[PDB]
Design a binder for these strands. Structure first.
Ligand SMILES: *P(=O)(O)OC[C@H]1O[C@@H](n2cnc3c(=O)[nH]c(N)nc32)[C@H](O)[C@@H]1O
Ligand SMILES: [Zn+2]
Ligand SMILES: [Zn+2]
Ligand SMILES: [Zn+2]
Lengths: 286, 278, 771, 150, 285
RNA sequence: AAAA
RNA sequence: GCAAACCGCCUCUGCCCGC
RNA sequence: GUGGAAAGGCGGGCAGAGGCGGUUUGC
């Protein structure tokens, strides 16, 4: 279909590539800052019905990357039948280890076509060492810290589907607030800051019964093919319990997911984003 | 609560050559961009140097600031390194690992501190978050083009160590950024309380003015600092800006002003329109 | 009982093959195995050896003619004394006969065993001892009768002092039949032990399947699905053993690798006992991945569906989605074991099961039913070591520093890590017993120490095939492990800080992770289960047994001169974390981790026939680098050596241009030629440089600074005369004469200049001097 | 032999260090190359290995005899020159106007190569076409130390 | 324990190279003056580092304190832990001799603790290091570039350096061994910057007078160079002492006390009447 | 993860 | 009538201690 | 309603020690 693509042009290093539950927690903190409490409860109701955002994925110079579906690994002997067998084995190995695909090869992997992987990743994970210095004696205490450093024209983006007045009233004012404050990590070191641009993405998807998730899922029923993701964040100092999400690219069938409210002992209820972002996929016989 | 984000832009001039090490072909390397190989000033190295200069500033004026800043009456000048007990009566109360740093342990205490209100506090159960963002300072576009045109952006300076009796020489090498370089800094203050933001902007500019006579990173005592702030503009970015995006925010123009002139003169004069919309 | 009689009939059916290659009696080895077992029933043996001579005289379909001489010969013996039914004994003979054809599908010479890696090369006969001898295939296809005669005498001595059970016989047979060829033919690459072992496996799976003697006489067990190939794999090992912080010592890691293997043995030994199988039904068990041949009965499919259900639910309670065991099974037939016509049916049924493992791994914890269900539990925390989430209060203080509250499964592995130098093995007993440190999904394991008595029905004894101090009612299960460690002044395992102190020149900790390349293609060329067994034991025995004797300083006439910084010590400061299957993870001093990577590869090159290669990633680290950091760099370096090309080593971190035409890792013969030319003209040995280069690090480091101008612009030619000026001013114009001019042949081949590949030789020499 | 070792692009810098470190064999192929350097009056026409090709064959000729640079170094610092290239041609004329004795021939061959490239530098821009000359002039001195001269 | 702040005494002026000055250096270089002088990579002109000036002032001051370990000990405690000499003939780090750290192979007096370096006249002014404590310095000496009239003589075409050829003559055969030394020309003039950080109002007289003692020793000794061959001859030309109190940074106004000694000598400030120049500093403490 |  | 021979660097040091 | 909040890679360290632009004889 047709989606609004929210590009995030970085102004430094990120802490991690953002997911949809820490994007919804960042947006719900942004809406509470510039509107108030009763607009976050109007935000959650907009997401529960209709429109839902996806996870954040890298881009590198007008090539928008998307996660590889998990539908290809049972098929991946049948995808590569037209190859010489001694180079069919190392083409298969790197086609299974690959995490992202181009916007051109994502649309082919949804239809079980022969496809190719990107060679170069738009970011790197470095370990930059910081230090703690005593204020009288200058006694150093090294600790280590990891970041996401992007290239010259690279960055990250997520997708939005839904009505326009929810985007132009909540999501578009939030990402202008969230550009000057951070998305995750030590934003007081200037980490999660960016400039925001809004664009348009069109994705060819076959009409089918199965669908891949482009966000974390929190499924209501057991999915078809999946990959377990085990994270639990932090909310106003309170540790969240770890939850079993489903990584991006896993296959569900008529499964909407669902946001789960937590208690955590605050003045308000904390919602963890668990909605699906379905794009139609084609499966083999299992 | 949230009211706006005072945005400070300008340039960092390295008047004498700058060193911020990585400890990873020069023997001690300054830290560099992983992709393009250009050096930069970290946001943590600039923030922690502004805090360290200001924690020593507040340690000298604990008695004189008991009334403008409460919960400076909970501290006595000194460090907690002699008696190995955290959050005691001394000012440098928290031992992160091997170093002692003033961090107030509570939200209601750090809200009245001058340091931890501006720079943030950890605490147990409490977690006061900071109000400023210090971005990474990368090279200006004029100094990226000098790098494309074949000039050198870092040198290799050889120092030595000399015996006081026999005069044996013991040399080492230090990579440091070439003196004269221009970096592009960015500080974003988060206006949470409309009452005390004038003090927080002035306490921040005081640490900038202590930094121009002190050094940044480096060896510094052997002349590796000598940093200089060159301001460009002070934006206010109100709450009405983030709702609708119509670009009618307050811009204070200081194209050629020092940190002493900015804090010394101006502020009421420069920040007069900022104080109107609160 | 017919259960023990069918299994020990098929195991000993080929007995006397080694007495006919020796020649103690008259010809036709089926006659000699009847006489070798009749004489064995006389002295130092029971009377069941007399009835097991029926299995060695009525096979290959040469004397079992017309169903008349089998009845008279069995009638002469007393079945009732043994208690076996007269008809039931006859039923077993047909099953043994059928399982012999299903295991091989295959003379007159004393021709040796040929190597499964080179079928053109052959093994000389040795023992299976892993001590002072490396079995390296050679072109010597001749076996002396006296050598066979010596083997028969040792075999006769050990079969007389050995209890008549499948577990007892299997280590006796393995010791002397490992290097004996089964069928005498040119290029026979199947071990005689493997053929005998796979024959007791199939004959016992046929007996559990219920097929009788007339089912074999009519050929009904063949061309009907009566067998069932079990296969398991642990998934998430890297995130299970190496996801540990700076609070994990070397001992804690070395206990994590011993605890994953006890989880693996607890599942495999549960399948064999609960289905009636012996240990010969296990085809291989190597690297968290096993394969078992069983029977296809509805009682067994019901019974394997509980072993899978209980073990996955145990792993989910203990380790919250960090380690998963995918168990699948595929029904096969007798004709499916072999090559039928020209089509390989064993490699097709194996890959019909390998696709079922693939879809199971994508349904990662689907057999839980509360997997994606949320449940609110208050007051949860994390362990400082492995970082699992528990409800707090279940945390308990660690014995190192009682301020930190670790989880209880990490204190069982700190206390196990202190016993591993003292440990002779384990005993498999019930979940709630005294002495149990760690629990599996089905059992608990008591450590069997130096001076002690083992308790349990199954005793796992490490690094030997002799049951010395073991009770005669307990089951003997041997397992092998690469357990080399550098010992401290105490009798324990050295630390990361103690190994790095011993390193030559700069003090760094060397970490290597290497594995065999395209092994899974090599195992798909096997067309019979007795051939998959041989290719999997010999590949496992290199990393289990022979990689620890490479570290002992042996095999030097095979290894020769490798790139070394110092001469090889008598006790190398090397600690093996893991080595088994086709991979190894070894830490130590950085000088010997560097040398052993070329020393393991040179011996693996000759352990195989030159036909299989390695890729090794090397890393050199600070002592206070956390091991989740040290295992993620060297795994990234192993995958960079593998994706770029196979048979290349990642020597050290280097800077290379982004054109896609440079690569970071060295081919093994490439780097080992660069060390023959660049190193003896700059390096003298044991940390010092040569004459006229002492205190000239202003030459060598600046040569790496000229090399960094090549990295910025490879087409700029500035670096060429800056080398000749630098070499010329210092008077060392003859050192490195090919870095001064551009290689015109390298431009046409689009391969890098010789200044690009001098980095990984100089850097190592500059770290062997104190840096 | 001498033209087989000192070939077109880069054949043997290590092979030319055996003959030069013999007298008249290089004195013909490099004099043809000095005539080719005289045919390289256009300086900025060699973006290939030709600058490294010529400077080996220049320094293999000047090795047979004895054999401004800081003025070329200070005018290199001026980039970050028509008034000083007159002085640079003057100091190069001053040296050949001074060196009498056994070193006239090495200085006249050194006079033969640079002043054809110092005529184009008069009527040319200064950021380009001098960087390509100062890379050549460094490469002549660099190999001249390598062959055993000073 | 208790590092405070009161102000930053700033010492500005000029470094006069009365005699040729050579601070040496050592990479894409082919034909040049051998044994070169250090130069700014962006502007090309030579300079004096803060490392070569602070280390030369510390070295002349340690040797002065080593000469008198019985005449400074009554005013400075923890000098009773030191005997005059060096730790060279017995290779232990911290024994009773004065020069007590091994840098690589040489021996330099650097105090090993915070409480030891707080009462030492050398290490409370120049700083120390060690296993823990790490007493940090109170002066910062900055790199001294040319003055802005010698920036412009370079624009006018004058030489800022030169090349001096010296010859090591064999004493037997009178056989030569020439070499060239670049040296910044005599008369050249470098602009320096020395900031003393007032951390204790009790002893700031003692650190300024010890810093001016070290400067007075340097005007009799040499800077950089090979100075026993006449290559040093430095001279300090003071422009202004300034005080910069703690209230200067918060207010940003010119509340800094300006001592006027634009025409005075380094031995004239430390000369009788020093009390008269630094009298207004005591009015602000 | 080429069966860690 | 005025020069021409060689000598153009030599030899030591070149990352430490802490987290 | 953000795997979050807090945290300077730096304390100390002279590119220095010894050295007459000089000698011998002729073409
Ligand atoms: P210290 O008492 O070591 O506190 C432990 C703490 O510090 C880190 N640490 C200390 N020294 C080093 C070092 O040389 N290198 C590294 N990478 N880390 C160091 C420990 O890792 C631990 O976090
Ligand atoms: Zn505070
Ligand atoms: Zn744990
Ligand atoms: Zn001292």
């Amino acid at each position: 279909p047709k989606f609004i693509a929210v590009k995030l042009i970085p102004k430094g290093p990120f802490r991690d590539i953002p997911r949809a539950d820490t994007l919804f927690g960042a947006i719900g903190n942004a809406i509470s800052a510039i509107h108030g409490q009763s607009a976050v409860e109007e935000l959650v109701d907009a997401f529960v019905g209709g429109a839902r955002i996806s996870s954040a994925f890298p881009y590198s110079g007008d090539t928008y990357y998307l996660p590889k579906p998990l539908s290809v690994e049972p098929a991946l002997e049948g995808i590569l039948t037209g190859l010489d067998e001694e180079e069919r084995y190392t083409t298969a190995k790197r086609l299974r280890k690959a995490k992202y695909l181009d916007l051109k090869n994502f649309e082919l992997a949804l239809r079980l076509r022969p496809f190719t992987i990107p060679e170069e990743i738009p970011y790197a994970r470095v370990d930059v060492p910081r230090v703690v210095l005593d204020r009288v004696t200058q006694d150093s205490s090294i600790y280590f810290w990891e970041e996401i450093r992007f290239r010259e024209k690279s960055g990250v983006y997520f997708l939005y589907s839904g009505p326009r007045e929810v985007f132009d009233g909540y999501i578009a004012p939030a990402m202008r607030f969230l550009g000057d404050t951070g998305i995750g990590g030590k934003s007081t070191w200037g980490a999660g800051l960016f400039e925001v641009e809004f664009h348009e993405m069109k994705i060819d998807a076959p009409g089918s019964e199965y669908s891949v998730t482009l966000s974390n899922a929190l499924p209501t029923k057991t999915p078809v093919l999946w990959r377990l993701l085990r994270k639990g964040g932090w909310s106003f100092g309170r540790r969240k319990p770890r939850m079993t999400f489903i990584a991006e690219g896993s296959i569900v069938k008529n499964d909407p997911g669902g946001m789960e409210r937590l208690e955590l002992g605050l003045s308000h209820e904390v919602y963890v984003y668990g909605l699906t972002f379905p794009l139609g996929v084609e499966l083999p016989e299992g | 609560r949230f009211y706006g984000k005072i945005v400070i832009k300008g340039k960092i001039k390295a008047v004498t050559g700058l060193h911020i090490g990585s400890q990873r072909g020069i023997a001690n390397p300054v830290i560099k961009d992983p992709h393009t190989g250009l050096p930069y000033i970290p946001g943590s190295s600039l923030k922690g140097r502004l805090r360290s200069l200001f924690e020593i500033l507040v340690n000298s004026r604990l008695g004189e600031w008991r009334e403008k800043y409460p919960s400076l009456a909970n501290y006595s000048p000194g460090s907690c390194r002699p008696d190995n007990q955290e959050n005691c009566g001394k000012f440098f109360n928290r031992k992160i690992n091997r170093g002692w740093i003033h961090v107030c342990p509570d939200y209601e205490t750090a809200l009245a501190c001058p340091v931890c209100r501006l720079f943030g506090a950890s605490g147990k159960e409490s977690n006061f978050p900071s109000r400023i963002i210090v971005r990474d300072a990368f090279l200006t576009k004029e100094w990226e083009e000098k790098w494309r045109a074949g000039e050198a952006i870092t040198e290799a300076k050889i120092e030595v160590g000399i015996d006081r009796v026999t005069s044996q020489a013991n040399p080492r090498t230090n990579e440091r950024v070439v003196a004269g370089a221009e970096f592009e800094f960015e500080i974003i203050y988060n206006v949470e309380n409309t009452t005390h933001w004038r003090d927080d902007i002035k306490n921040l500019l005081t640490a900038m003015a202590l930094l121009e006579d002190s050094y940044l990173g480096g060896s510094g005592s052997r002349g590796y600092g000598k940093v200089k702030f060159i301001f460009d503009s002070f934006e206010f970015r109100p709450l009405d800006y983030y709702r609708t995006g119509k670009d009618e925010d307050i811009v204070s123009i200081d194209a050629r002003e020092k940190s002493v002139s900015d804090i010394l003169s101006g502020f009421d004069s420069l920040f007069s329109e900022v104080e109107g919309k609160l | 009982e017919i259960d023990e009689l069918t299994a020990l009939g098929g195991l000993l059916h080929d007995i006397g093959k080694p007495v006919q290659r020796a020649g103690l009696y008259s010809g036709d080895h089926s006659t000699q195995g009847a006489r070798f077992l009749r004489d064995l029933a006389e002295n130092t043996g029971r009377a069941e050896y007399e009835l097991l001579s029926l299995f060695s005289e009525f096979h290959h379909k040469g004397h079992m003619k017309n169903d008349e001489l089998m009845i008279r010969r069995i009638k002469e013996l007393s079945p009732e004394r043994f208690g076996l039914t007269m008809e039931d004994v006859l039923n077993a003979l047909w099953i043994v006969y059928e399982a012999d054809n299903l295991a091989s599908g295959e003379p007159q010479a004393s021709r040796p065993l040929y190597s499964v890696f080179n079928p053109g090369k052959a093994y000389p006969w040795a023992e299976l001892d892993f001590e002072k001898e490396l079995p390296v295939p050679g072109d010597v296809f001749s076996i002396r009768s006296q050598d066979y005669r010596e083997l028969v005498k040792r075999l006769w001595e050990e079969l007389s002092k050995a209890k008549l059970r499948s577990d007892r016989l299997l280590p006796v047979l393995e010791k002397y039949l490992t290097f004996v060829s089964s069928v005498t033919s040119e290029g026979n690459i199947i071990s005689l032990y493997d053929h005998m072992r796979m024959t007791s496996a199939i004959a016992l799976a046929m007996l559990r399947a219920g097929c009788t003697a007339e089912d074999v006489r009519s050929g009904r067990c063949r061309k009907e699905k009566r067998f069932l190939l079990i296969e398991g794999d642990f998934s998430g090992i890297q995130d299970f053993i190496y996801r540990v912080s700076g609070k994990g010592t070397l001992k804690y890691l070395r206990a994590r690798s011993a605890y994953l293997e006890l989880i693996g043995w607890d599942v495999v030994l549960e399948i064999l006992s609960r289905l009636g199988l012996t240990r010969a039904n296990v085809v291989f068990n190597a690297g968290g991945h096993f394969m078992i041949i069983a029977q296809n009965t509805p009682d067994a499919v019901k019974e394997l569906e509980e072993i899978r259900a209980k073990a996955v639910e145990w792993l989910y309670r203990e380790f919250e989605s960090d380690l998963y065991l995918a168990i699948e099974w595929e029904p096969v037939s007798g004709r499916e074991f072999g090559r039928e016509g020209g089509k390989n049916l064993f490699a097709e049924a194996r890959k019909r099961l390998k696709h079922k493992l693939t879809v199971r791994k994508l349904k990662r914890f689907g057999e839980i039913k509360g997997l994606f269900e949320h449940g609110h539990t208050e007051r949860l925390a994390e362990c400082p070591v492995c970082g699992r989430e528990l409800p707090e209060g279940k945390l308990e203080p660690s014995a190192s520093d009682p301020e930190t509250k670790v989880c209880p499964t990490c204190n069982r592995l700190v206390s196990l890590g202190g016993n591993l130098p003292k440990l002779l093995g384990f005993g498999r007993t019930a979940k709630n017993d005294a002495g149990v440190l760690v629990e599996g999904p089905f059992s608990g394991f008591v450590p069997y120490l130096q001076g002690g008595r083992p308790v349990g029905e199954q005793i796992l004894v490490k690094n030997t095939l002799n049951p010395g101090e073991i009770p005669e009612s307990a089951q003997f299960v041997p397992y092998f492990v690469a357990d080399y460690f550098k010992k401290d002044p105490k009798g324990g395992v050295a630390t990361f800080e103690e190994l790095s102190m011993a390193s030559t020149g700069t003090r760094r900790l060397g970490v290597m992770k290497g594995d065999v390349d395209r092994l899974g293609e090599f195992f798909s060329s096997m067309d019979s289960p007795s051939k998959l067994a041989t290719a999997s034991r010999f590949m496992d025995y290199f990393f289990k047994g022979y990689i620890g004797a490479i570290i002992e300083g042996k095999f030097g006439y095979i290894i020769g001169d490798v790139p070394s910084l110092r001469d090889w010590p008598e006790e190398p400061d090397i600690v093996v974390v893991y080595a088994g299957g086709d991979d190894f993870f070894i830490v130590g001093a950085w000088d010997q981790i560097f040398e052993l990577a070329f020393r393991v590869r040179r011996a693996f090159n000759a352990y195989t026939g030159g036909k299989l290669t390695l890729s090794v990633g090397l890393g050199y680290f600070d002592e206070r680098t956390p091991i989740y950091r040290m295992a993620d760099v060297v795994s990234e370096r192993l995958d960079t050596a593998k994706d770029e090309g196979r048979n290349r080593v990642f020597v050290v971190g280097r800077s290379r241009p982004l054109d896609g035409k440079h690569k970071l890792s060295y081919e093994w013969n490439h780097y080992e030629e660069l060390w023959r030319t660049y190193a003896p003209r700059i390096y003298a040995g044991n940390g010092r440089l040569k004459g006229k280069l002492e205190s000239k690090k202003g030459l060598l480091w600046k040569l790496l600074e000229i090399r960094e101008l090549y990295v910025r612009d490879p087409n700029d030619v500035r670096w060429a005369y800056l080398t000749a000026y630098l070499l010329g001013r210092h008077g060392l114009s003859d050192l490195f004469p090919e870095l001064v001019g551009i290689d015109t042949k390298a431009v046409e081949r689009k391969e890098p200049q010789p200044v690009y590949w001098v980095d990984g030789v100089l850097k190592i020499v500059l770290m062997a001097v104190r840096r | 032999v001498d033209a087989s070792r000192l070939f077109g692009e880069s054949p043997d810098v290590v092979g030319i260090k055996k003959m030069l470190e013999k007298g008249k064999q290089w004195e013909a192929i490099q004099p043809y190359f000095d005539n080719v350097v005289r045919e390289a009056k256009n300086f900025l026409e060699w973006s290939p290995n030709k600058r490294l090709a010529n400077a080996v064959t220049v320094a293999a000729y000047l090795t047979s005899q004895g054999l401004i640079l800081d003025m070329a170094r200070t005018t290199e610092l001026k980039v970050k020159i028509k008034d000083d290239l007159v002085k640079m041609r003057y100091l190069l004329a001053y040296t050949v106007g001074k060196a009498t004795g056994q070193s006239k021939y090495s200085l006249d061959a050194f006079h033969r190569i640079l002043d054809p490239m110092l005529e184009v530098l008069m009527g040319s821009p200064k950021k380009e076409n001098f960087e390509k000359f100062y890379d050549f002039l460094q490469a002549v001195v660099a190999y001249h130390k390598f062959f055993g001269g000073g």
